[model samples]
Target: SGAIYVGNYRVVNRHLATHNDWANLVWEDSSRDLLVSSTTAQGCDTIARCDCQTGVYYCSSRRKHYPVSFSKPSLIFVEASEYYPARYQSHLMLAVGHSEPGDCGGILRCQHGVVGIVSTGGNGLVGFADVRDLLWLDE
Candidate 1:
């Protein structure tokens, strides 16, 4: 069993969406790099190219699961920052209710596949930066 320390990955790249507090990181290391969405026990399956909305589910803290509907892309307060969506932008991000600390990086999923990633959460709500915005460059 080769279990590299789970938290020490190099941030090779990242992106910050304008206006909205939407951002993501790319963590990697040559020796400890893991496969993506594999079928093994440690494998996590997700669909990054597909679009999702409305009903979705994710876990926050232990096994506490939350069922949330994709609300409008309005201004949401996540962590300590405020995310402001563009007036004309449509469905670039998703907002849901009922969130907690330590829920960041959680996956918002559905029966179809993984929908979004929890970028920020707290105060009974969570904001997921859409997986569609993820850049596939530089692995």
Candidate 2:
């Protein structure tokens, strides 16, 4: 049997306020990329972007609250370096946390259509998977 498919979706972009556990997972069509933002309750924030084609990840951020404390969050792009499989799909994890050696928390697999949060040893991590092998572009 053929599966029913829906092709309508929307994306929202706006300035995210301060608060613990505040994050946004988004996919942009124009850039063909996925972006995740993890916030640290008025302390720090981390931003990660993944290339949909090459599966490369880039992360950057700045400190907001504490001047002396390590407020910059650490960025990790899981599954970003692996190649797409032929049959089954694997999971990808993204994490960010506080700079205090261990005090941050983020999400796991909380991208696309999935939902979940991932916590690190005082840091944050998010994970997800790509199940389809659809060619995103035609050369």
Candidate 3:
């Protein structure tokens, strides 16, 4: 519910790929990825994006954090209804037990690595676009 700022890195810009590959295995062209400062790469691990995840989830948003779990696969009504081809199962929704606008973009991490980037949340739940085949990170 506030402005977004990276911990140590400044966002140079962001790139969006709106290609609809919902039924495809590499449906990562869904989320927009941020371009950050080179200094931000200094100590970060090259975490692999999850193809699928089960069990627990961790999302830290500002002063609040939640250890939630998968609730269902979701489709934004507007995106699914108006957008071409529809954004059907692209979003993995969770039962965070809370809601906040700032929760968007929080890393949806599992026990091993990242599942996706938080996309939206309200009514004690949140959604994320799958990053299993996130392309930019490959370079």
Between prediction 1 and prediction 3, which has the larger TM-score? Answer: 3
| Cand. 3 TM to true fold | 0.50
Instruction: Kindly list the per-residue Cα lDDT of model 3 for residues 1-139, writing each as its tens digit.
Output: 1112223322211222222212222222332322333233333433345544453333454355556666544555423322233434444555555545445555555665555556555666666544445444445
lDDT of 1 by residue, 1-139 (tens): 1111112221110122222211322332211111112111232354444444664655556556677777533343322233233222223345556655445556666665555555544555566645443344213
RMSD of each: 10.2, 15.8, 8.3
lDDT of 3 at 92: 53
lDDT of 3 at 43: 37
Least well predicted 10-residue stretch by lDDT in candidate 3: 12-21
Q: Model 2, 28-62: lDDT tens per residue?
A: 22121222333222321122232332222111122
- Local distance difference test scores for all models: 0.41, 0.23, 0.43
Pairs clashing in candidate 3?
1-102
Question: Which order, best to worst by TM-score?
Answer: 3, 1, 2
TM-score of each: 0.47, 0.18, 0.50
User: Native-vs-model 1 lDDT?
Assistant: 0.41
Minimum summed lDDT over a 10-residue window in model 1 is located at 1-10
